[PDB]
Write a structure and sequence with these properties.
The chain has 444 residues and is α+β, with helices and mostly antiparallel strands. The chain contains 14 helices and 18 strands. The chain binds oxaloacetate ion, manganese (II) ion (MN) and zinc ion. The site of oxaloacetate ion has 7 residues, from strand 8 and strand 13. The PDB classes it as transferase.
Amino acid sequence: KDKLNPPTPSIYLENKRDAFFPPLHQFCTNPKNPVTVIRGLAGALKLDLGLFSTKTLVEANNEHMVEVRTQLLQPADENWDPTGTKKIWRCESNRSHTTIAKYAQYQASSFQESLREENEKRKGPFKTIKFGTNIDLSDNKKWKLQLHELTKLPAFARVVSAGNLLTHVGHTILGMNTVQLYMKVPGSRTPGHQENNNFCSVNINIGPGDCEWFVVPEDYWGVLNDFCEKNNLNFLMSSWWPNLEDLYEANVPVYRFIQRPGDLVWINAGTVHWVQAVGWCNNIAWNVGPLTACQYKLAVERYEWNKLKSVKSPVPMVHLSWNMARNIKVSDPKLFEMIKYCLLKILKQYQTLREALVAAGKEVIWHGRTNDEPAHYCSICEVEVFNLLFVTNESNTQKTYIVHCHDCARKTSKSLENFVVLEQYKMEDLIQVYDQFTLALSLS
Ligand SMILES: O=C([O-])CC(=O)C(=O)O
Ligand SMILES: [Mn+2]
Ligand SMILES: [Zn+2]
């Protein structure tokens, strides 16, 4: 079908007015648009992209860490097995570390070398390339001018804003509410994925070269999960590059487009995507969580799915849900009912566990909390642990407070005789927050 190759939802900005025009924000967060390409964004705002050039980055922090992926240079939109016999989903992508200064040297010599081949005149085997990915730009003292430039964006796309759920988590989540940088040569690939806990994402191409994007709507993700499983791949943990002919056969629509320097790509919640550099360029990216029923719903879904698959959730959705109820006036009835439902479930589970402990003669110790203290995860299984913390007698005395969930503590110590139970919130107080959480009136 032509319907299997749909057009790209696109918007063309000329000036600051187009960029701050409220219908732009509405268009991006509309569930019907899996992706929005905002063309000419940096030009419209007069953003100085030179602050993110490789020359500038070397001058700023030349010894900064870079994660290196070593890959094969594949043709166009395909992925072949090493021998060049057939197209397969598994990608080769070996990891190591380098510095900005050393990768910059490779990026430049790569370009010079291709200029020479181009002046040498006239199925693989395939060449090896290196991709510099996941560069951490969270430190405001090291990247002051870079981070300040991104505050020039319209509020809905900023790393920090009052309407961003990730701003309401209350603590740093590396690479989600902090910026990541990518340094590339032609063929550099980001393999197939959904964002952490299905949060929206923003990506800006610094240039000077182009990137090519491939996008599949959220509601087809189960089909791609099946494909991975049938090819001995973990959808969440493995590196895979979809065979477009497999997808077409399975009637999965694929959005395909070019991202030019200064173009901003908005990836909506749960949208599946993979990317390759066409030329030499850098990119920057981070996550955003719009206050919509759609975003909250997909975030909760992936949170629960990650438990089944034994994968850690970077976003602590229990911690976040209480913060929303404490600090955010919710005027959408669907969104309000979703949050209320979740809090009620947390509250009942917490009540059940607490009374089981008390009925069995186990002391609950009042421990309390520091404000802005991050959520806790189980030191063994990495599930989020809220309020009732399980700590060993020894870690307690030493004041190390190494957190365990109830299930892991039990599996170790049958009657919890090796543990103490710490409580961070009084029950009356959580009941109060829940009770005072009501639907606000908005006429919008
Ligand atoms: O390689 C990049 O530009 C980062 C990327 O694909 C993404 O935003 O998922
Ligand atoms: Mn992404
Ligand atoms: Zn555990």
